[PDB]
Amino acid sequence: YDLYGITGQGVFKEVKADYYNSWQTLLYDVNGNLNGFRDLTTNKTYTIR
Amino acid sequence: FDKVKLSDVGFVEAYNNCTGGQEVRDLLCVQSFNGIKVLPPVLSESQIS
């Protein structure tokens, strides 16, 4: 993938998340990995492994 | 074995939930993804018992 500039590879699993307020979109973990993502064109949520 | 979660036989059980992509929030599956995986010992724990 290349999600909005962020480069990486893995799976996508659609899970109905919550509380991505308005500006905060990309869900990082504690270690600076990408652990979750919101698309700006569909208002949908995902979780990356 | 009831008290300690990460016992000797429990490691490969903890590694088997890593591959499927379910409830992958624990830290042990992340360590195997970067090569630091615990190996089982030579004798099984059934054998020493």
UniProtKB/Swiss-Prot annotation, chain B:
What protein is this chain from?
A: Spike protein S2'
Query: Which residues of the parent chain are present?
Result: 877 to 925 of 1324
Q: Which residues are glycosylated?
A: 17
Domain of life the protein comes from: Viruses
Organism of origin: Murine coronavirus (strain A59)
- Functional note: Acts as a viral fusion peptide which is unmasked following S2 cleavage occurring upon virus endocytosis.
In residue numbers, the region (Fusion peptide 1) covers: 1-15
| Annotated region (Fusion peptide 2), positions in chain | 13-33
Q: List the disulfide bonds.
A: 18-29
